[PDB]
Design a protein around this ligand. Structure first.
Ligand SMILES: CC(=O)N[C@H]1[C@@H](OP(=O)(O)OP(=O)(O)OC[C@H]2O[C@@H](n3ccc(=O)[nH]c3=O)[C@H](O)[C@@H]2O)O[C@H](CO)[C@@H](O)[C@@H]1O[C@H](C)C(=O)N[C@@H](C)C(=O)O
Ligand SMILES: N[C@@H](CCC(=O)O)C(=O)O
Length: 266
């Protein structure tokens, strides 16, 4: 039996964070849960999102006591953390765009932020940009379409590079584009290869994955309750739809043998 860790996202983006966590802590009892019923969260009202994520974690907790939970979703983290930390007695990890380290890595002072449409309109974002990136200029680019490209990719469809170039056209037309790009959407690291083929040579991609993994390992050491299981890793969807089912092969490649429907009360 090993500590049970939940990794949550509205869709497949959570898998990029999970991938980093499992690389650091490979023997844990992982539970991956994705809200295919309410995806995408980017458009949704914040009041709905908070209630929804709290309800999903509540349902997961009923199936398995949790040692720790990761909200590997930018559009949910910020607004949901206080509520989740109040209701549960296990540490909760959140995610915010890696602007801070990107600001210390840029050489030309131009830092780009790729996030979903809803994330670039949040006050939480605008604030972080001023708090740890006062010495550099931030180029924001929100794209709900890129999220879909990531979803498509893990569903078996090939990513159209032309679609990406179009989305990134603004940056490709810059005299001096960002030399550092923050992936502020957990779906984006999944498109790393494609992004590197389209973005100008020398662009460095930065995300929160490895840092989340380290934070997870620290919490499992200094805060997580003794909640463990010997059961194999499992993936939960909120509705057994063709779309969710189509993720089975990828989920299996990621280490989740089974995909089951989770009953949620919210
Ligand atoms: C060990 C620690 O306290 N880390 C905090 C610190 O990040 P810093 O860049 O200095 O170091 P790092 O831990 O290597 O993190 C790198 C980057 O990864 C991301 N990161 C890291 C840890 C985490 O739990 N969540 C997260 O989103 C951040 O964008 C951070 O900017 O400063 C960041 C900016 O304030 C914090 O988001 C980050 O997480 C802490 C644990 C935190 O409070 N995170 C938020 C999400 C929360 O729990 O409410
Ligand atoms: N994984 C995405 C979720 C995108 C969405 O649901 O709109 C994020 O980090 O917010």
């Amino acid at each position: 039996p090993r500590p049970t860790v939940l990794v949550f996202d509205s869709g497949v983006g959570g898998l990029s964070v999970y991938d980093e966590i499992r690389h650091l802590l490979p023997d844990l009892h992982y539970i991956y849960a994705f809200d295919n019923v309410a995806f995408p969260y980017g458009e949704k009202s914040e009041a709905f999102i908070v209630e929804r994520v709290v309800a999903i974690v509540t349902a997961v907790q009923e199936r398995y006591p949790l040692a720790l939970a990761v909200v590997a979703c930018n559009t949910a983290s910020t607004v949901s953390l206080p509520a989740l930390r109040e209701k549960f007695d296990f540490p909760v990890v959140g995610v915010v765009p890696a602007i801070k380290p990107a600001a210390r890595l840029t050489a030309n002072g131009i830092v780009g932020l790729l996030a979903t449409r809803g994330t670039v309109k949040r006050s939480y974002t605008h604030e972080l940009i001023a708090r740890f990136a006062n010495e550099c200029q931030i180029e924001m680019l929100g794209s709900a379409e890129m999220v879909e490209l990531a979803e498509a990719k893990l569903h078996g469809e090939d990513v159209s590079l032309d679609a990406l170039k179009r989305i990134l056209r603004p940056w490709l037309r810059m005299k001096e584009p960002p030399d550092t790009v923050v992936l502020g959407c957990t779906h984006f690291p999944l498109l790393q290869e494609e992004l590197l083929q389209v973005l100008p040579e020398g662009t460095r991609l930065v995300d929160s994955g490895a840092a989340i993994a380290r934070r997870t390992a620290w919490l499992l050491e200094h805060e997580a309750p003794d909640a463990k299981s010997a059961d194999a890793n499992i993936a939960f969807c909120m509705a057994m739809t063709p779309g969710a089912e189509q993720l089975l092969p990828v989920l299996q490649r990621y280490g989740f043998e089974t995909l089951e429907k989770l009953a949620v009360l919210g």
